[PDB]
Amino acid sequence: VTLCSPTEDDWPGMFLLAAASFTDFIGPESATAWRTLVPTDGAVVVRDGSEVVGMALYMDLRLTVPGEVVLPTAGLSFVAVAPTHRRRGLLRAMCAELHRRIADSGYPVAALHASEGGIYGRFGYGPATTLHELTVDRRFARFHADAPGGGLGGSSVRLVRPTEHRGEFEAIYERWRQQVPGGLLRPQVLWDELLAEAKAAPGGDRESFALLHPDGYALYRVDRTDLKLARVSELRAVTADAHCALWRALIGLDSMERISIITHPQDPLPHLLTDTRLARTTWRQDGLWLRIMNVPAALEARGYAHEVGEFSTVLEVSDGGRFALKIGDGRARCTPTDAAAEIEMDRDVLGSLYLGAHRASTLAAANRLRTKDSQLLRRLDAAFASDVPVQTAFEF
Amino acid sequence: VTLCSPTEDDWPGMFLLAAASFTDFIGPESATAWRTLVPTDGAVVVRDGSEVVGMALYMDLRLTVPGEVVLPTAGLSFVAVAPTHRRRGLLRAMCAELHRRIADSGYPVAALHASEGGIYGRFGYGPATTLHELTVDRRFARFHADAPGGGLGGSSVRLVRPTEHRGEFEAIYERWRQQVPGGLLRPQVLWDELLAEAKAAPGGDRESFALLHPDGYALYRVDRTDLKLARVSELRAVTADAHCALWRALIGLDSMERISIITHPQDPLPHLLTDTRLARTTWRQDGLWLRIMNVPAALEARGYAHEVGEFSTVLEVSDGGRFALKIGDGRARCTPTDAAAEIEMDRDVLGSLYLGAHRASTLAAANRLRTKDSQLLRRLDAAFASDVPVQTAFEF
Amino acid sequence: VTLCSPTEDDWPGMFLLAAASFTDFIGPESATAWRTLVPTDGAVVVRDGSEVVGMALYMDLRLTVPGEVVLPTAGLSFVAVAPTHRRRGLLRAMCAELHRRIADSGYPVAALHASEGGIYGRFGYGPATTLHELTVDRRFARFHADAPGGGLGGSSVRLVRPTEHRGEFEAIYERWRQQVPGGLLRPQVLWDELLAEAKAAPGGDRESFALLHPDGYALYRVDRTDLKLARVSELRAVTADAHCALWRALIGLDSMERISIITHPQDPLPHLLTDTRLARTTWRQDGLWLRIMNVPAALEARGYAHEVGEFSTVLEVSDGGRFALKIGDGRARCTPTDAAAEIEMDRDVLGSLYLGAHRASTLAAANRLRTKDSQLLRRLDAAFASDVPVQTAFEF
Amino acid sequence: VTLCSPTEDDWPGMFLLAAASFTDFIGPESATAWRTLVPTDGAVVVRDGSEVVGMALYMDLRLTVPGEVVLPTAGLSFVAVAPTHRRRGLLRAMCAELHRRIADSGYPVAALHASEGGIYGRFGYGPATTLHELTVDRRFARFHADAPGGGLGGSSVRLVRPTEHRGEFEAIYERWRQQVPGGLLRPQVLWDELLAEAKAAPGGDRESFALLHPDGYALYRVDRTDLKLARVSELRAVTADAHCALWRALIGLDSMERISIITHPQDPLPHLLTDTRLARTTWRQDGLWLRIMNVPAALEARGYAHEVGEFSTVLEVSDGGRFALKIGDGRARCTPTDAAAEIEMDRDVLGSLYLGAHRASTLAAANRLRTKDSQLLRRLDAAFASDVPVQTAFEF
Numbered sequence A, B, C, D: 001v002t003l004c005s006p007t008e009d010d011w012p013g014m015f016l017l018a019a020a021s022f023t024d025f026i027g028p029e030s031a032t033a034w035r036t037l038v039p040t041d042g043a044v045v046v047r048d049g050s051e052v053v054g055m056a057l058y059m060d061l062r063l064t065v066p067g068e069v070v071l072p073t074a075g076l077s078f079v080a081v082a083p084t085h086r087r088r089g090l091l092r093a094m095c096a097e098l099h100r101r102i103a104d105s106g107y108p109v110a111a112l113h114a115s116e117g118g119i120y121g122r123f124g125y126g127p128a129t130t131l132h133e134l135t136v137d138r139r140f141a142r143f144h145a146d147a148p149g150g151g152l153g154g155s156s157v158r159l160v161r162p163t164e165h166r167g168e169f170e171a172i173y174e175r176w177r178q179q180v181p182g183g184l185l186r187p188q189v190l191w192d193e194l195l196a197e198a199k200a201a202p203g204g205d206r207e208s209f210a211l212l213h214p215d216g217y218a219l220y221r222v223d224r225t226d227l228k229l230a231r232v233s234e235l236r237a238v239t240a241d242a243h244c245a246l247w248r249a250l251i252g253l254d255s256m257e258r259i260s261i262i263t264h265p266q267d268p269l270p271h272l273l274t275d276t277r278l279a280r281t282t283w284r285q286d287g288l289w290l291r292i293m294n295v296p297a298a299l300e301a302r303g304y305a306h307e308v309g310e311f312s313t314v315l316e317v318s319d320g321g322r323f324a325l326k327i328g329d330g331r332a333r334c335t336p337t338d339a340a341a342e343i344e345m346d347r348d349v350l351g352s353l354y355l356g357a358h359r360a361s362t363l364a365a366a367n368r369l370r371t372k373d374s375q376l377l378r379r380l381d382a383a384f385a386s387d388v389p390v391q392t393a394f395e396f
């Protein structure tokens, strides 16, 4: 069984594998558009001999991390092993080859969205963002006296067809992704794809609409089977006024009983309402997963909380080296050392800490990171925290 | 219609109101035991004239807040208005009288568990702890290689009948409540009540068992209707070893498909498992609500994060005064001032910040607290944070 | 196989049959209390030979019919055929013997509640009252500006324990049953039974409460499994003020999401609310069934609408004779004749018309009553109508 | 914000509002066909300034009322306010302008189908017809010995494709609508629309079939998801024979478990069967709502029951004048007066009485109409009753 970069003749077989392997494959046309983000040598296949029995690739992405720093990021995707060739070491072989190519190419981090929670930790990936579904019974929803934008005049939100305001969505999203940890650059082809999904499909999803504000937008559609549920596919807002104004509009959808959205744990929505319980958490799950490819480059590139005072420690990553880590004035220096470790963790744990979604203290309580210094734990919690709460851009 | 402290002859009428008003009233015998925590003059009734059409009381509690400081706390409970006398201002009249008595008695804070999320904010109460239900499909659950207590020998957890180990539970819980923000002292009568609920009831709840470790315990029972679900009513652990050891035992319940528990958002359980997704969040809700009765006494009594450097600001509470607030070396000083406010919020918002469960930044994003200084927001977030994550002791 | 009046030694066998035959037999103690309403010779049994394989009886009841006239009525009940002796003509034999005894005793009507809708029509019984379940989502319920009793003062409804106000319920119900078609006298033993069912049962129904007004009462309990549903078992009101006042109280049950009641199609409740749709009809079914034993006595005893002008016709009942029927000034005369019939119907159809619940026009449209005179249909509709809407007293 | 009659350029914006506002908008093509019934100046829009944030219109309809009298009727429809502009008085402004145009144009009544039960009462609309869903478990259904058309020969019903017998459906429906209170003239464009909906849609509704009798038809289709349920979309019959014959055919659908239909409370179907319970009422709701624009013209145009003897009274409508009302020989005279009122009601209440669906007595019991004369109530009940039961034609 051989492993190599696929040629053009391999792709019909790869699409076949994908169609049969994923729960709901996006299809050849969509995947070809996404493929424009895959660099030369960014893909591997495994052939039996000869049909394709395995595949995996990465895309070139730009990920925003705390301190508004943007890192080149390898986004793994299109990963499959044929049902006929399970438990043969094929995933391990493909991941190791891609990680070698990703490291040699100069990516400081790789990332992915996990199909199952138990597979990727052993390859050094830790979950780094958290998805929260909120479901609002809008029949009871009333805005608090303090909520922005409820004076006495015209409304700032418009209600439009998505495809006729492409430029404004692009510009709003671009501002959002640059300021939020977890943000991803969305190139033109992904806007093509997004707007194609906005149209209704015969025996499919219903037509999408948009609520448009100068500093934010929401895209929504009525659920296909529950016609009293509106699903917000995406809501991006760069000011509190825009966020509140958009939610006022959504709660104005008097045909609906419920509005649902996939958002993050620090979404201010529940505090916008007189009854905070009306914004029910109906689902919670890991979002973006991260593998730190180069520890010192990743740790030095990120900004850190100014509130914590300067401190130094020694960090060992289980098979990623040992480093003298000094954090102060919101910056880190991270240099090689053979001095005794004060903190130890597996590589995946560092990825889970990296964007601020998980506290070092909490990971210590599970013994996923080891130290005999509780003061150091407190300092790590505070330093790795993010002023702007971590969010999930889009699935890939 | 008159309002006064009830006499012994008022109580049969009060129990009648309670039986008809609550969703599932705990009954006269239980409520009489809880009543031993209600001080003289801690209860009010409203009579029509003459039957009882309204009631409310508070109990004397001890609440642990960040920095392991224990505050006397008035716990409101047994609040009802007759269905025949709604919208007549009776709740407002009872709350105002009790708050006057609570303030004059010297309580710096009052607290409650809300029957509905939309009622108590206008009386100055903000939700201050967060309840998380986790449901674990234990059939797939495997512990991570790093998880504590999986060497090669005997187990540290015992499996016992609750009533035969009362002393050990008391002692473990006492250690827990003193070190955790949100902890409440549990007096003898509440242990009597807890252990009475451990026994099976004909056509009722099934018998409870316990898993006992030197540094932690879990109480559980099989669900009454779903016999493949075990419900953990309470799990208290003072070391990571005890917490992990108890979960190993619970996942050892091979008769069950699922184990559920009401816990907090920072429970390390998901990180104990190879697949973090198996610990599903099935429910989320506000737990303990807080009203700060005396702003400067509450703010000075609490410990604050050492990591943030000394800073000063001016805080106005909407009808609770304006104060010069200086925080440094983990302590606050909070004195009267007429200088211009830098931060403004309603009283309920301060309660939501007080134990560390909600970030000032997040509340600012909802306009529930107003300031024109983002640096100050960052400093408040960091200072009000709690080293030990906030938890909910028991419902009242 | 023999048929006869049972002796005291037959009753243990009869209770056994009942326990095994009914869906949820009320039990020996309850049935013994109801048995006090069964006259000497009011019961029949069938023995195999010798065990009891069949039984049926009637009770002595007082039924109110239009014009506030009270008729002695034979209430059939406790009817069973052993599963081992089906399709052997046993029901037909028992019904014919009881009907002979009922007719010879001088009852002008018999009545029953049907376990299945398809059994009793062929024995001359027609459904004569209609049951309507209304379910009110009380969270949205607001009373119309016109609704009685919403001024500015004390409430007229009290909230009490049922057993402590037995006399007031008795007196309110007695007034109700005498003025409403379908009303039944409720003797002392049935009040004993009713109040016994008001208490909670271990692994059973929850405790009942009452809302008491000078001119009406409601008895309710929380559902055993859905703790957000209150079931009104009985609501009896003699003035519009009492009816509205009681519903104001019920909608004041803020612990509940929904209030349900078994009522009648003309219940004014939906018109009491600003949104008439909130009172949802969740169930509809035949209630009391009637067999007219003596046509001329039943037709002459009833009062008729004054609005229709005097008219005469000839009515044939398929095996109950032919009569000259003259209606005027709210009274009927009904005498033997051999003149040609203008209207024909089966006996069961006349029972369905008798209390005003079903229109002659509607029955004609199904060909259940035959005439070649549409003017006569209009006159029958109007004459048999009841000023006071027909209701169902209690099940037997 | 301005209100005016829309120009052709306003309609793309109006269709956008409609697509986003309704639960399941019928779409631009269908709505354009319905628009042919909207007269010049029958539509209003509200612009923000400028996009369309509000709209409403009326169609020219012909409504049959008791006594087979046909009234020109303004049918309100296509009513929407943008979710961005709620609670700004826009609905009230549009309704008042349309009602002014409707009144000045000479319509004696307006009508609508309500999207929610709580909105239209305050604009003078009362619910005037009642919809009843019946669900028949046809596996048990047997016709009564009396039911028409069960002799010994050929059947009168045919089973056909709807589009090939358009003329016969038109002619049957035309006869029906002229004789039934609630009937509406169905012009050609609505027959085009109806027959277009008869065809199957890919990932949509299944194909419709018809059962055709000389004096009646039924249109039905199998449910999209429950393939054992047949839904009768429309059944119109002008004789009892046709009605029964069509139901015999429907119960002949041996592939189905259940047949459902939206019908009216006096549908004779349950009396056609040996077990009347098999026709279960699974749903009940208000149908057509009515606003009487001109009280004396509406009251004089309607026919009244001949059975009641001549009587006179004085009726006040709360903001619609006071009139001397005299009813006799099936006709009313209704003239201005300043004499003391004997009956008072809001305008919406009169609409609810107008077609005979609701009894004055029942509305009095809710205090929605006030009088101190019970004899007068009885006379109003009898006079406003309809010989032919009130039905609902089609939704708009």
Ligand SMILES: CC(C)(COP(=O)(O)OP(=O)(O)OC[C@H]1O[C@@H](n2cnc3c(N)ncnc32)[C@H](O)[C@@H]1OP(=O)(O)O)[C@@H](O)C(=O)NCCC(=O)NCCS
Pocket: A021, A076, A077, A078, A079, A080, A081, A085, A086, A087, A088, A089, A090, A091, A092, A093, A112, A113, A114, A115, A119, A396
């Ligand atoms: C999981 C996966 C790719 C199959 O891989 P595979 O070739 O069977 O895995 P390998 O043979 O390389 O196994 C290597 C190790 O991983 C483990 N492993 C891999 N998949 C596993 C699974 N589903 N369950 C349990 N263990 C698994 C093996 O037990 C093995 O352990 P070992 O090292 O102790 O022997 C396959 O289930 C799949 O298609 N997943 C979809 C991935 C995805 O969608 N990713 C998101 C981007 S598209």
Ligand SMILES: CC(C)(COP(=O)(O)OP(=O)(O)OC[C@H]1O[C@@H](n2cnc3c(N)ncnc32)[C@H](O)[C@@H]1OP(=O)(O)O)[C@@H](O)C(=O)NCCC(=O)NCCS
Pocket: B021, B076, B077, B078, B079, B080, B081, B085, B086, B087, B088, B089, B090, B091, B092, B093, B112, B113, B114, B115, B119, B396, C254
């Ligand atoms: C809520 C409550 C006590 C009823 O109180 P009430 O006497 O009707 O309230 P009041 O008449 O004092 O109303 C005062 C204000 O509160 C508001 N309010 C109170 N309960 C409300 C409810 N359920 N919904 C909406 N508003 C409410 C009123 O609108 C009013 O507003 P205003 O000041 O603008 O006029 C009752 O529903 C209840 O029994 N709640 C249970 C409380 C509980 O269990 N607490 C936990 C400890 S046991």
Ligand SMILES: CC(C)(COP(=O)(O)OP(=O)(O)OC[C@H]1O[C@@H](n2cnc3c(N)ncnc32)[C@H](O)[C@@H]1OP(=O)(O)O)[C@@H](O)C(=O)NCCC(=O)NCCS
Pocket: C021, C076, C077, C078, C079, C080, C081, C085, C086, C087, C088, C089, C090, C091, C092, C093, C112, C113, C114, C115, C119, C396
């Ligand atoms: C229905 C019943 C009593 C059984 O009676 P049975 O002895 O089998 O009936 P018979 O043998 O006398 O049958 C006589 C006729 O009734 C019909 N019949 C009786 N019960 C029937 C049923 N459940 N289904 C269909 N037909 C039935 C027979 O077909 C027969 O028709 P025929 O005259 O054309 O031959 C039995 O099912 C029962 O226990 N019902 C409960 C009644 C009840 O609860 N009443 C309310 C007061 S407690």
Ligand SMILES: CC(C)(COP(=O)(O)OP(=O)(O)OC[C@H]1O[C@@H](n2cnc3c(N)ncnc32)[C@H](O)[C@@H]1OP(=O)(O)O)[C@@H](O)C(=O)NCCC(=O)NCCS
Pocket: A254, D021, D076, D077, D078, D079, D080, D081, D085, D086, D087, D088, D089, D090, D091, D092, D093, D112, D113, D114, D115, D119, D396
């Ligand atoms: C209801 C409706 C049109 C929104 O209207 P709106 O512009 O917000 O209403 P207005 O601002 O004119 O409000 C006027 C009054 O009506 C009341 N009102 C209107 N809609 C209401 C609702 N959904 N709930 C509660 N009250 C409402 C307001 O409280 C206000 O009361 P006030 O006079 O005491 O202040 C909107 O929900 C809708 O689109 N409905 C669909 C109507 C429909 O489909 N009709 C059938 C033919 S298509």
Ligand SMILES: CC1=C(c2cccc(Cl)c2)S(=O)(=O)N=C1NCCCN1CCOCC1
Pocket: A018, A025, A026, A027, A031, A032, A034, A035, A038, A057, A059, A077, A078, A079, A113, A114, A115, A116, A395, A396
């Ligand atoms: C963008 C994309 C794919 C892709 C990307 C780049 C190149 C190519 Cl040829 C294809 S995909 O593998 O086809 N599926 C995709 N998105 C949907 C899959 C999301 N997963 C996340 C993990 O939980 C299951 C669903």
Ligand SMILES: CC1=C(c2cccc(Cl)c2)S(=O)(=O)N=C1NCCCN1CCOCC1
Pocket: B018, B025, B026, B027, B031, B032, B034, B035, B038, B057, B059, B077, B078, B079, B113, B114, B115, B116, B395, B396
């Ligand atoms: C301890 C207690 C009560 C009590 C307390 C002190 C004195 C007396 Cl006389 C009674 S209680 O009001 O009867 N109900 C109680 N616990 C259950 C109620 C919990 N609520 C919290 C809010 O969501 C609804 C359930």
Ligand SMILES: CC1=C(c2cccc(Cl)c2)S(=O)(=O)N=C1NCCCN1CCOCC1
Pocket: C018, C025, C026, C027, C031, C032, C034, C035, C038, C057, C059, C077, C078, C079, C113, C114, C115, C116, C395, C396
């Ligand atoms: C009052 C009574 C009974 C009774 C009456 C008189 C004398 C004796 Cl010994 C018993 S019973 O037959 O036991 N069941 C009874 N009520 C419940 C049955 C109601 N039926 C009505 C039809 O749908 C099934 C339930």
Ligand SMILES: CC1=C(c2cccc(Cl)c2)S(=O)(=O)N=C1NCCCN1CCOCC1
Pocket: D018, D025, D026, D027, D031, D032, D034, D035, D038, D057, D059, D077, D078, D079, D113, D114, D115, D116, D395, D396
């Ligand atoms: C006929 C029609 C419309 C119509 C009518 C005239 C002109 C025009 Cl441009 C459109 S509609 O508003 O688009 N929706 C319609 N029927 C379906 C809506 C029925 N409502 C009734 C109330 O409960 C919600 C559904």
